[PDB]
Amino acid sequence: PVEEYLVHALQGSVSSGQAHSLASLAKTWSDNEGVLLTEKLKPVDYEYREEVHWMTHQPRVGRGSFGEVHRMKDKQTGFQCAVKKVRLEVFRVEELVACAGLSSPRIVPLYGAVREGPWVNIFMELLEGGSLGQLIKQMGCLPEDRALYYLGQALEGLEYLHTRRILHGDVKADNVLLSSDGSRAALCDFGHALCLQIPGTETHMAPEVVMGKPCDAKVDIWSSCCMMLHMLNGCHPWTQYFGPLCLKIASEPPPIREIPPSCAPLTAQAIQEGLRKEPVHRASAMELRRKVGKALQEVGGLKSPWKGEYKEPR
Numbered sequence: 342p343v344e345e346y347l348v349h350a351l352q353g354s355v356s357s358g359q360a361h362s363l364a365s366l367a368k369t370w371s372d373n374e375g376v377l378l379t380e381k382l383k384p385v386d387y388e389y390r391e392e393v394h395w396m397t398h399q400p401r402v403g404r405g406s407f408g409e410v411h412r413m414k415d416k417q418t419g420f421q422c423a424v425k426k427v428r429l430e431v432f433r434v435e436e437l438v439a440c441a442g443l444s445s446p447r448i449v450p451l452y453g454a455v456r457e458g459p460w461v462n463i464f465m466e467l468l469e470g471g472s473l474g475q476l477i478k479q480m481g482c483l484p485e486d487r488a489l490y491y492l493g494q495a496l497e498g499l500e501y502l503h504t505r506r507i508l509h510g511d512v513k514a515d516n517v518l519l520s521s522d523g524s525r526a527a528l529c530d531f532g533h534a535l536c537l538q539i540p541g542t543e544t545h546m547a548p549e550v551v552m553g554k555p556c557d558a559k560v561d562i563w564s565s566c567c568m569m570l571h572m573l574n575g576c577h578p579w580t581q582y583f584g585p586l587c588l589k590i591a592s593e594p595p596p597i598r599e600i601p602p603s604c605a606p607l608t609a610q611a612i613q614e615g616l617r618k619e620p621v622h623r624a625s626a627m628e629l630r631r632k633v634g635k636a637l638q639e640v641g642g643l644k645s646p647w648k649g650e651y652k653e654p655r
């Protein structure tokens with residue numbers, strides 16, 4: 342009714358506004374329009390067009406699975422951030438709706454979203470430490486205490502999301518970004534998200550996902566523990582032993598055989614409680630974050646350097 346009227350006032354234009362206005366407009370995304378949420382990205386005469394009001398980094402390099410994430414500059418403000426390009430035809434409303442208006446240290450801030458032609462350009466804080474995925478490739482694999490430290494932070498983000506009945510849907514190293522000193526980790530990429538009451542990465546898929554069963558917040562927990570194994574071992578679960586990986590996840594025992602023997606007992610225990618095949622038996626974000634918290638205390642806290650020495654994968 343009035344929502345109809347607000348939406349009309351937003352269509353056809355790029356404006357500065359609040360998270361709720363971006364959500365409402367987003368819903369119409371199944372021509373240059375959208376909403377910018379920070380003072381640092383500013384429309385000019387109803388517009389925000391690539392290579393006119395904003396420009397991506399000089400020689401076009403990119404991050405993400407599809408090389409779709411870029412460093413960018415507002416031409417007027419000079420402010421630097423990041424953009425994820427999503428194809429309009431494939432844009433999921435939920436990537437913005439389950440995202441806009443959140444505010445947590447453990448979740449990457451949304452800066453706005455603008456439609457231009459066949460593109461939905463989603464803007465966000467540029468996290469300069471890169472992704473946890475890049476770190477793992479750089480370092481070979483992570484020390485136990487660093488792995489726990491980041492797993493806890495990811496879990497705090499999941500706590501925050503789960504309380505709001507948002508499923509992340511693709512929890513993994515590649516989707517955990519780091520500040521420039523490595524001390525702050527945050528969840529990004531809500532391209533797979535779903536609001537509770539296009540699938541994630543196959544290796545990190547929970548059995549109930551793979552089997553087509555009913556899914557809740559607990560899927561994120563399983564994914565996060567697969568990510569933990571990725572951190573410790575320097576490779577995804579199921580890689581070493583296995584054919585289509587989605588068949589083995591359903592039938593086979595959880596990949597707890599991949600917990601390194603070197604890990605401390607409570608680290609091992611925690612990964613096991615997050616890798617229970619049945620969701621009822623699997624730990625919640627709150628439960629697991631607490632365990633992982635003491636797990637990190639049990640190995641003397643965070644001590645190892647963020648970029649220490651290389652360590653060979655398994």
Ligand SMILES: C[C@@](O)(C#Cc1ccc2c(c1)N(c1nc(N)ncc1Cl)CC2)c1nccs1
Pocket residue numbers: 404405406410423424425436440448449450451452463464465466467468469471472515516518528529530531532
């Ligand atoms: C739009 C969104 O769905 C996203 C995203 C997204 C997806 C993949 C990748 C990134 C980002 N990356 C980075 N992204 C930033 N910002 N800085 C540094 C990096 Cl290395 C690399 C890989 C959002 N996620 C969270 C709030 S909006």
